[PDB]
Amino acid sequence: HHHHHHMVHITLDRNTANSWLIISKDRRQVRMGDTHQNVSDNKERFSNYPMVLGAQRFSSGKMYWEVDVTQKEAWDLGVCRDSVQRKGQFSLSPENGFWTIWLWQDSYEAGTSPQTTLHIQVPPCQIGIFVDYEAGVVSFYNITDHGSLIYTFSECVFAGPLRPFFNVGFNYSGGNAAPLKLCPL
C-alpha cells in the first residue's frame, strides 16, 4: 500500500480511558494497570472494558496511523463514532458505531456482526489503520508482513465524527500486560 503519506500523529485521551488504564506522559502508550488508577469517574470513561479513544476527531479526508501490539494475547483496534456507548455491555459492530479487528485466543477476527475470520500467516507486531472518510473505507495492514492487507470495511456509514479506538484487553492470564503503542511516523 501507499497510504503512509496520510500519516497522522495520534494521542490518547485520558478522560475517555477505563479507570484501570495507565497512559504514558507522551499520550502515545497505554497498558492495563493491576488496580484502579485513582482517577474520578466521568460520563466519557468506558466502564466495562479496558478501552480508550484517541483525542483526534476526523470528519473528512484520508488518515493513516500504526499501532504496536508486540507480545499481546488480546486487543481490539480500529475507529469508532464519537457518540459510541461508554457504559455497560455492548458488541463491537458497525451497527454500534465501531470498525475494528481483534486478536482473541490465538485467532484474528473483524468486528462485523457476526464476526469474520481473518487469514493471517505472519502474526503482526504492528498494525496499520487507514480511514478514507469520503469513500466510507477502513482498512487494516500487517506492517510485519510488508504491509499486506488484513481486512477492508467498505460502504461504511460513519454517521458522525470518528475517533481512533483501542482496547488493551484484560490480563486474567498474566500473559497480556504489554502496552499498545502508537508508532512514530
Ligand SMILES: Fc1ccc(NC2CCOCC2)nc1
Ligand atoms: F512486548 C512487551 C512489552 C512490555 C511488556 N510488559 C510490560 C508490563 C508492565 O511492566 C513493563 C513491561 N510485555 C511485553
